Write a protein that binds this ligand. Structure first.
Ligand SMILES: [Mg+2]
Ligand SMILES: [Zn+2]
Ligand SMILES: [Zn+2]
Lengths: 93, 78, 284, 113, 326, 1083
DNA sequence: GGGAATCTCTTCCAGCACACAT
RNA sequence: AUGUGUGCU
DNA sequence: AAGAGATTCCC
């Protein structure tokens, strides 16, 4: 099993929608610094050697645990193509 | 018509170029400006492009996701 | 009727040194060779003299020499001088055939990051996961492990980490712990011998298990019809974060609990399980 | 033009045949045994096809990336990696027209019909 | 167990069913080893009435045989006679194998396996304790002398030989078709790779009526369609017009769960509806592809089929997988 | 140790020398034994005179032939890539039409492979063997007509391929059609050729069925003596009517086209014994004065009418009655190829008469050395029929020779016709095993010969049958043919007998191949022993009568791949064939003559023959098998002991004191255990490793060649140009690594360089091990082949001993395969009340669905075997039964329990609990004392067992006992793949190579459809390009992961942009339009 | 102008292995 | 790199 | 190699 996937599949129209959402989320979450997360204070994924999952082990786990809360919104067209790419690299390292 | 007889004559020449006699599927389709509608999987796989289904479906392929921290920044100069 | 002959790009026809000094050139260079030989012999010819036999015979030779380049095997069979009676692989052959550019991706291609071994029952693990021997986990996930070895005090830089795993006795605790930190949520694809239906390849989370055989969960056997009597299975790693994302969502075993063919559970209790349950739930 | 949608095939005119070509293979020359460099404007010449090397040109007037899309003043060498070598086509101007055996030899003669 | 996993799948979810399944896999093992279930030579308890089921058979044929020698029945007829005798006899002894357990040895290590979903088979257990039947000759005919012995007791030399005939045939019937596993999925893929569910709904309203009655079992007699068949023709489909039957009104264009079909058959028994209107790929408007409503349910789970699924390949495979079983 | 036999059917005759089909056939296939003037015309010699007098002035003649002394010995050919052949001399003279007689004896016109005393031929430095072949025997036959079950057709097969295929059919109209080659014509005309009057014909055929009116006629058509020839030629060979037909006479005559199968053997005996009456000469020709004569034709006609009419003694042939299908043995294959070559030689001598100068030309002008060489060389190395000798264990090697294959030269069996041919016909009984057929595809097309069965020159299989005098059994063994067997009533070997007299009013028997119960008078023959039904492997399976035919097959087929264990035990329950198997398979070494022992070394055994002779015996320790296993001969007698003639002195790779040791005897408890024995998986005790139980020795042979290139002469030296001395620490010899060194995946085995970069030989990603032998064939080589261009070869034998690890494949004789799942330590393993733990745990769920209760019994007897320390011999169908096993168990129980009851211990509380539950179960009898309850349980093979990891007794008694389990030839280290990124190829970018990586896994259409059906487009495309062929993106990802970034996707599909170019090479144009039709760049 | 016969071209199947051969 | 053969699935 | 389709020849 995975972090509440039934909530995730129901969360979208098609099952593939969820996959693309999660994927792209992970991508931007890794490319523009792992800081642009939407649940980093206390309710966040952790690991077992140290609690150091707080930085950058897995990309997808984060995306799935994030979507679980109403912090992100998917959809067809939301933001202009280039502008998004620009500002998402500006606001973060 | 039979299943193999069916698939023997798909419009998309890209597909028939693999199974059927290639030199023929190309010679015959060349004389008539045949638009290969890149839709069939087998057809669209010979090239490399993501298969037109699942995570590659147009209905899903073009989707974005953002948070409010960026949504606001974009919201301003809109 | 083409009066200009399009020549293929270089590397698509590699004139390459092999070993000792052997040179493998794709037969295409050899074909393009005689083409120029006749062509130039034709253009220069029209300048000096112009005999009918000479020039006409020349035209025929050209028309044939270009056909050789296009579709070899329709008129005799142009051969490299006594050493190999084989016909030179023409441009037409570079496409048509089992090993061409049409039947190419459809059925072939050997994957890179991968492996295989003998399947074994995997009692002490869940559907979500599978048992994959240490050596494999290390080899398959080599570069990830390199970078994570750099992130910590396991190796100075990338190269030092590359040399760090060179000999088989270097694998210390640090490297293994790192190797656990390089997977966590990552999943691998396990492939059956004859792949038949959709549920013929599943995604499991790798567990670093000792032994040398792939450990596989009991319940997902009847899916891709596997028994433990010599069977083998292959393994891949969906590298891209996108590939990972889709793999652990739509290709993960615990998510595919019903057969696309019919609304029946295909991960139902099988042999031993049912026995054990039936034994305790009957009256005397 | 950023999204490839569908793909059409058709016969190509002499002009179109030459449109993809960046020069004429006016020699049957491949590679010298001594210098593995290309020969006499034949099948491997950088002028028509591409720079045998990476980003470096023929002689060496321009040698790095800073001037990525520039041609050398004295010899024609525009440079990406050895990819522009493997991507660019050249051609051959036959003295006498010749027909495509594909359209000649076929179960239905594409020309005899 | 299977039905339970299915119901719990649609009631508690998918991720939950995972945990449930693994719990079963655990406890089931753990108890399968405490149980002390094992196969001993005695475990294959042979029916007590064996000798009599044979006796009454022998003393039967003794008469029948004589009827031939006098000139009553013909060659064909007696050939069929021996057939009926032994076919009835074997099937009769089977009942003895399975009943003797249920009466005097309820938890028989060989019986609990064959009874539950463990390894075991009715006519197979009939061979360990009861006797093997008549064997197939090398031709389409059968030996008039059945292997009158069981695998537990000494199966005699000659019997083994008249058994090997069919024994080797089996190997052909399986191992030859082990190569044909990539043939039908192949031919079916070549034409179905273009089909995919990339639409929400189509502008059409064409359906078909799946027969809940079979007109052709006897010469021409209409009756209840097979329990199994109907389920595969209605499960997870979409109606074309609202239909009320047992008392509840089935929504128009609704994704039918299995129970929908259940009460539909229970309604068909009382003579309510004869057929059911249903959307199908057979009548989709989408040139290349099928729409969500027209396809139906299946999505490795009981959910509305996701928009974008490669249903062509999936179906071709679904038809290809059990091709080798035929 | 010791034994207790059970078999009570007195084996009247010992089993034949198992390897005779390969040996005797070959010995008879050449006159190298007896002088060139003696008998035995057949074989090579025959082949001579069939194409020897090549009359044209050209008349050669068979003036004796001799060879036999090989270039190089048995072992030396194995080390130096050679053949155990012999230079073919043969004495050959020429006689011209005119005067003058020039002769020149010996001509090196080729070589010829000999055979070891075991049955193989070392070809090209590799032990190979040519199996036998079954095929329809050339002769006259009568089978039903395809479309009409009313009339029948005749058939006259004559091998080889060149040679007609005659069929006689009575056309429904009435006329009888002669079918020659394929074409048809009035047969009456050919009847007229031979000189048949309408009257005599009317007589002979008219005899019965009126059907003669269909042929006898042709008044206007058959009123011409010699003209039938001239007319036949016109109607058969479109051309000119002179004497060409009178010459074709010979073609459907003798010498040429028709079969040269002697006057008496194949054609004769088959024809007569089946149909017709007479054969006058090899085939149909007698031409005293140009005229014709015939014998086979007219009986053929006669028998045809007989069948298509009344009942002149039931005339029906069965296509695959086996009494119609010969068996080309090895010598027949060899001799046939020899004939084929001789023919080509004769074509050469036919050609050369034109290139002659004067008269004499016997030696160097006519007879050449290319045809014969072509015949004999190609065969022993290209024939589908000759293969690698399967030498996993001695038994395997033995079986491989005793096998019969249908697949052959194609003129007899194809590979697109089966299902019906594969079926066990009736006459395979005693002749061919109805079990041995290798499962999987190609099943039925291969069948091993039965035990006692043997070929009788003529080809057909004969079975040993004990005839009987009315009521009493005769001690005469008649070997009957399949066709002769039907003509009798034979009883089974289980029938009760008083010394030699029948003692049962009703006797089980079998008439023309069917179960019939008769009286002691109608018995005429009797099967020797039930052991004659099955091939030897099946006969190495105890309690077979309690196994399914399907399981028994696997059981019989498992032994062929049983790896020779260093400490291999004999089966605790065996059949008796073991002792015979080791000796007949030439596994171990025995004594040749009585005497005492001189010197028992680990390399020799010297024997004290009374005749003042001590003959030297080698005892060879580590000789690499053809498969990879290791063959070791270890001594079994101590110095100062008197041995007898025919007694063992040493053991083979798979023997224990003379018994076929193909595995281990392990105390098995059959019960489910957690999930570890799920499906067919097997649980195993750690103890089995602590005492080297399942340990093998595999010797991997590596090699390198020294090709002398012109761009740079390669050579082997102790020099590796670039980096370390540490890697050269093992390099002892000047170029060769030391013997006894430890090599590991990546370690340097050989040192050599080419044009200077290192191109040496290192140890593959698999595993090295410990070096045992280093063979080096240099330039100054005292008589070797050596590959062209190569100067010298360096072969290294790297051995290693492998223990039983999780993942290895284990199985038994009854046919239960199963890979090892877990090796639980001794403490947490199910153990008896005695301190003794169990070795192997086998799931009971594997039993009922396969109906092989053989394991169950082997285990049962195995219990008593364990506690009495005495193995057993239980013959196939006359071995041990329930009462005997149970009775022995009662005996062992007294040891196992008397020890405790005596020592000061009694019934454990746990035992009592288990008994209490067993009462409710139904096993024990309610009432008895706990001791007697335990007795009742022990009788049933079952015994109280403790969980081991808890102490809690397993509630419910489980059957335990030692069974025979063998480690199969598969291992896991032999098959282990795990490479992420390594070498590729210059010609194809798809990843494979064995430097530091194994090789990339194959990703077929089956897998691609799976990915597509999942809809995992990203993964799939990533799989087809990024990780396979797309070089441009491969390095992208490889650079991405190193830095830690996400894997970049391929923007422009590589295999697409390349296809664009490959398509633009022609006059074709691939336009990549946009969404609304507009050109789009790709580069 | 149609029908039949003959010749030529194309299809040619699930996975890994180990072999050898060309 | 293709064919033959066998082994396992 | 076997089967299917196309082409050519004869009626
Ligand atoms: Mg299996
Ligand atoms: Zn320059
Ligand atoms: Zn639709």
């Amino acid at each position: 099993a995975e972090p509440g996937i039934d909530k995730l599949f129901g969360m979208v129209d098609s099952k593939y929608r969820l996959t693309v959402v999660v994927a792209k989320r992970a991508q931007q979450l890794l490319r523009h610094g792992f800081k642009n997360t939407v649940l980093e204070p206390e309710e966040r994924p952790k690991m077992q050697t140290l609690e150091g999952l707080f930085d950058d082990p897995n990309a997808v786990t984060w995306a799935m645990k994030e979507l679980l809360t109403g912090r992100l919104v998917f959809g067809e067209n939301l933001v202009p193509e280039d502008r998004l790419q620009k500002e998402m690299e500006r606001l973060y390292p | 018509m039979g299943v193999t007889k069916s698939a023997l004559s798909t419009k998309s020449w890209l597909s028939a170029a693999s199974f059927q006699n290639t030199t023929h599927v190309l010679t015959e389709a060349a004389i008539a400006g045949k638009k290969d509608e890149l839709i069939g999987l087998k057809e669209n796989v010979i090239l490399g492009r993501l298969i037109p289904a699942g995570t590659g479906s147009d209905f899903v392929r073009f989707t974005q996701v953002v948070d409010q921290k960026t949504l606001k920044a974009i919201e301003e100069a809109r | 009727i083409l009066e200009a002959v399009p020549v293929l790009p270089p590397d698509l026809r590699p004139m390459v040194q092999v070993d000792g000094g052997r040179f493998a050139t794709s037969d295409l260079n050899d074909l393009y060779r005689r083409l120029i030989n006749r062509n130039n012999r034709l253009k220069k010819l029209l300048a000096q003299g112009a005999p009918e036999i000479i020039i006409r015979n020349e035209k025929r030779m050209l028309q044939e020499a270009v056909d050789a380049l296009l579709d070899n095997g329709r008129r005799g069979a142009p051969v490299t001088n006594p050493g190999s009676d084989r016909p030179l692989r023409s441009l037409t052959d570079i496409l048509s055939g089992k090993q061409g550019r049409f039947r190419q991706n459809l059925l072939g291609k050997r994957v890179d990051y991968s492996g295989r071994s003998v399947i074994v029952v995997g009692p002490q693990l869940k559907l979500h996961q599978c048992g994959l021997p240490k050596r494999m986990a290390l080899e398959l996930f080599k570069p990830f492990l390199l970078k994570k070895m750099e992130e910590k005090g396991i190796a100075p830089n990338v190269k030092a980490a590359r040399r760090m795993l060179e000999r088989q006795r270097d694998i210390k605790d640090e490297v293994w712990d790192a190797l656990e930190e390089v997977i966590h949520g990552k999943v691998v694809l396990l492939n059956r011998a004859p792949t038949l239906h959709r549920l013929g390849i599943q995604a499991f989370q790798p567990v670093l298990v000792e032994g040398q055989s792939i450990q596989l969960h009991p319940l997902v056997c009847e899916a891709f019809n596997a028994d433990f009597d010599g069977d083998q299975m292959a393994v891949h790693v969906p590298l891209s974060s996108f590939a990972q994302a889709e793999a652990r969502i739509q290709m993960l075993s615990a998510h595919n609990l019903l057969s696309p063919a019919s609304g029946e559970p295909l991960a139902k209790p099988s042999r031993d399980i049912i026995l054990g349950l039936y034994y305790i739930t009957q009256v005397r | 033009k950023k999204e490839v949608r569908k793909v059409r095939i058709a016969l190509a005119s002499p002009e179109k045949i030459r449109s993809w070509s960046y020069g004429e293979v006016e020699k049957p020359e491949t590679i010298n045994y001594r210098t593995l460099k290309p020969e006499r404007d034949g099948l491997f010449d950088e002028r028509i096809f591409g720079p045998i090397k990476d980003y470096e040109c023929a002689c060496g007037k321009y040698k790095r990336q800073r001037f990525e899309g520039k041609v050398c003043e004295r010899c024609g060498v525009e440079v990406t990696k050895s990819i522009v070598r493997r991507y660019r086509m050249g051609h051959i101007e036959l003295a006498t027209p010749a027909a495509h055996i594909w359209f000649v030899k076929d179960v239905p003669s594409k020309i005899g019909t | 167990l299977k039905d339970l996993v299915y119901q719990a799948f649609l009631r508690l979810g998918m991720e939950k069913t995972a945990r449930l399944l693994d719990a079963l896999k655990y406890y089931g093992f753990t108890f399968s080893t405490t149980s002390g279930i094992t196969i001993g030579i005695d475990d294959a308890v042979i029916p007590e009435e064996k000798k009599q089921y044979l006796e009454e058979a022998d003393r039967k044929l003794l008469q029948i045989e004589q009827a031939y020698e006098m000139g009553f029945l013909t060659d064909r007829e007696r050939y069929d006679q021996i057939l009926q005798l032994w076919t009835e006899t074997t099937e009769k002894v089977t009942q003895a194998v399975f009943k003797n357990f249920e009466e005097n040895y309820p938890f028989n290590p060989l019986y609990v396996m064959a009874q539950s979903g463990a390894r075991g088979n009715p006519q197979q257990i009939r061979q360990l304790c009861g006797l093997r039947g008549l064997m197939q000759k090398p031709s389409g005919e059968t030996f008039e002398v059945p292997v009158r012995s069981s695998f537990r007791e000494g199966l005699t030399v000659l019997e083994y030989f008249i058994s090997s005939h069919g024994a080797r045939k089996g190997g052909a019937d399986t191992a030859l078709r082990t190569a044909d596993s990539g043939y039908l999925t192949r031919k079916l893929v070549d034409v179905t790779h273009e089909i995919v569910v990339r639409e929400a709904d189509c502008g059409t309203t064409n359906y078909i009526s799946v027969p809940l009655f079979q007109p052709d079992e006897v010469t021409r007699s209409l009756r209840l369609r097979k329990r199994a068949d109907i389920e595969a023709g209605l499960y997870g489909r979409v109606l074309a017009r609202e239909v009320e039957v047992l008392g509840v009104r089935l929504e128009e264009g609704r994704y039918l769960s299995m129970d929908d079909v259940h009460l539909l058959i229970k309604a068909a028994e009382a003579g309510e509806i004869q057929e059911v209107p249903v959307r199908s790929p057979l009548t989709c408007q989408t040139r290349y592809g099928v729409c969500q409503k027209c396809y139906g349910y299946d999505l490795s789970m009981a959910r509305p089929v996701s928009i974008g699924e490669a249903v062509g390949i999936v179906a071709a495979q679904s038809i290809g997988e059990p091709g080798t079983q035929l | 140790m010791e034994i207790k036999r059970f078999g009570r059917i007195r084996e009247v005759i010992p089993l034949p020398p198992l390897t005779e089909i390969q040996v005797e056939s070959y010995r008879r296939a050449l006159q190298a034994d007896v002088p060139p003037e003696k008998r035995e015309n057949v074989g090579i010699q025959a082949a001579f005179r069939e194409t020897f007098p090549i009359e044209e002035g050209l008349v050669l003649d068979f003036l004796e032939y001799r060879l036999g002394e090989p270039p190089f010995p048995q072992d030396e050919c194995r080390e130096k890539d050679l053949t155990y052949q012999a230079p073919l001399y043969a004495r050959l003279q020429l006689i011209h039409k005119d005067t003058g007689l020039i002769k020149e004896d010996e001509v090196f016109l080729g070589h010829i492979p000999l055979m070891t005393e075991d049955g193989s031929f070392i070809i090209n430095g590799a032990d190979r063997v040519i199996v036998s072949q079954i095929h329809r025997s050339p002769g006259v036959y009568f089978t039903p007509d395809p479309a009409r079950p009313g009339r029948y057709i005749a058939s006259i097969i004559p091998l080889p391929k060149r040679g007609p295929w005659i069929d006689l059919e009575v056309e429904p109209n009435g006329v009888v059609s002669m079918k020659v080659n394929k074409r048809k014509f009035p047969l009456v005309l050919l009847l007229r050729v031979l000189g048949y009057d309408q009257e005599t014909l009317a007589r002979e055929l008219g005899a019965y069925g009126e059907l003669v009116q269909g042929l006898m006629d042709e008044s206007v058509f058959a009123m011409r003596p010699e003209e039938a020839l001239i007319r036949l030629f016109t109607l058969l060979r479109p051309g000119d009517p002179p004497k060409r037909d009178k010459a074709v006479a010979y073609v459907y005559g003798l010498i040429a086209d028709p079969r040269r199968y002697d006057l008496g053997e194949a054609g004769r005996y088959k024809a007569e014994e089946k149909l017709g009456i007479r054969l006058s000469g090899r085939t149909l020709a007698r031409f005293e004065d140009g005229e014709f004569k015939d014998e086979v034709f007219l009986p053929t006609l006669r028998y045809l009418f007989a069948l298509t009419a009344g009942v002149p003694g039931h005339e029906v042939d069965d296509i695959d009655h086996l009494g119609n299908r010969r068996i080309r043995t090895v010598g027949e294959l060899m001799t046939d190829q020899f004939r084929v070559g001789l023919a080509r030689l004769a074509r050469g001598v036919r050609e050369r008469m034109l290139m002659g100068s004067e008269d004499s030309l016997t030696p160097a002008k006519l007879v050449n050395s290319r045809p014969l060489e072509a015949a004999i060389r190609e065969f022993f190395s290209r024939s589908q029929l000759s293969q690698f000798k399967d030498e996993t264990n001695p038994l395997s090697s033995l079986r491989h020779k005793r096998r019969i294959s249908a697949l052959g030269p194609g003129g007899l069996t194809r590979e697109r016709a089966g299902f019906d041919v594969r079926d066990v016909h009736r006459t395979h009984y005693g002749r061919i095993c109805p079990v041995e057929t290798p499962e999987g595809a190609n099943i039925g097309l291969i069948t091993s010969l039965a035990a006692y069965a043997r070929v009788d020159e003529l080809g057909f299989i004969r079975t040993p049958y004990r005839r009987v005098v009315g009521g009493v059994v005769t001690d005469e063994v008649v070997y009957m043919t399949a066709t002769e067997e039907d003509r009798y009533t034979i009883a089974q070997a289980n029938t009760p007998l008083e010394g030699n007299r029948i003692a049962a009013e009703r006797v089980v028997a079998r008439r023309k191949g069917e179960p019939v119960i008769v009286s002691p008078e109608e018995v005429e023959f009797m099967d020797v022993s039930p052991k004659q039904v099955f091939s030897v492997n099946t006969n190495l399976i105890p309690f077979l009568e309690h196994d399914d035919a399907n399981r028994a097959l696997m059981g019989s087929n498992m032994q062929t791949q049983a790896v020779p264990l260093i400490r291999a035990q004999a089966p605790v329950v065996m059949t008796g064939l073991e002792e015979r198997v080791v000796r007949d398979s030439l596994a171990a070494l025995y004594a040749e003559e009585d005497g005492e022992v001189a010197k028992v070394d680990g390399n020799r055994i010297v024997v004290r023959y009374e005749d003042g002779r001590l003959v030297e015996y080698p005892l060879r320790r580590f000789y690499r098998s053809n498969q990879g296993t290791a063959l070791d001969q270890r001594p079994r007698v101590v110095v100062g002991q008197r041995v007898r003639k025919g007694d063992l002195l040493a053991d083979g790779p798979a023997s224990e004191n003379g018994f076929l040791a193909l595995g281990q005897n392990v105390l098995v408890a059959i019960m489910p255990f957690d999930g570890y024995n799920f499906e067919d998986a097997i649980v195993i005790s750690e103890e089995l490793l602590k005492r080297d139980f399942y340990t093998s020795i595999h010797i991997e042979r590596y090699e390198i060649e020294a090709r002398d290139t012109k761009l740079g002469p390669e050579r082997i030296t102790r020099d590796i140009p670039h980096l370390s001395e540490a890697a050269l620490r093992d390099l002892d010899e000047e170029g060769v690594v030391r013997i006894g060194a430890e090599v590991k995946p990546g370690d340097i085995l050989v040192g050599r360089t080419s044009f200077v970069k290192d191109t040496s030989l290192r140890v593959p990603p698999g595993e090295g091990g410990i070096v045992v032998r280093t063979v080096r064939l240099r330039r100054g080589d005292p008589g070797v082949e050596l590959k062209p261009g190569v100067r010298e070869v360096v072969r290294v034998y790297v051995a290693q001993k492998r223990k039983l690890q999780v993942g290895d494949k284990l199985a038994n004789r009854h046919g239960n395969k199963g890979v090892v799942a877990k090796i639980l330590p001794v403490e947490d393993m199910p153990h008896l009340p005695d301190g003794t733990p169990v070795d192997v745990i086998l799931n009971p769920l594997g039993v009922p669905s396969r109906m092989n209760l053989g394991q169950i019994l082997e285990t049962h007897l195995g219990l008593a075997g364990y506690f009495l320390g005495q193995r057993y011999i239980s013959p196939i169908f006359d071995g041990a039964k329930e009462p005997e096993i149970k009775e022995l168990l009662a005996q062992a129980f007294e040891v196992y329990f008397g020890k405790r009851k005596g020592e000061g211990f009694g019934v454990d509380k746990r035992e009592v609990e288990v008994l209490r539950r067993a009462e409710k179960l139904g096993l024990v009898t309610p009432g008895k004392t706990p001791e007697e309850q335990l007795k009742e349980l022990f009788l049933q093979g079952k015994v109280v067992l403790y969980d081991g990891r808890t102490g809690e007794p397993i509630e419910g008694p489980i059957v335990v006992g030692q069974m025979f389990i063998m480690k199969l030839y598969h291992m896991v280290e032999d098959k282990m793949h795990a490479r992420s990124t390594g070498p590729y190829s210059l010609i194809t970018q798809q990843p494979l190579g064995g430097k530091a990586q194994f090789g990339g896994q194959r990703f077929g259409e089956m897998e691609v459809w799976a990915l597509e059906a999942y809809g995992a487009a990203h993964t799939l495309q990533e799989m087809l390009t990024l990780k396979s062929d797309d070089i441009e993106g491969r390095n992208a990802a490889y650079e991405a992961i190193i830095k830690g970034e996400d894997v970049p996707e391929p923007s422009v599909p590589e295999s697409f942009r390349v296809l664009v170019k490959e398509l633009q090479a022609l006059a074709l144009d691939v336009q990549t339009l946009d969404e609304k039709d507009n050109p789009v760049d790709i580069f």
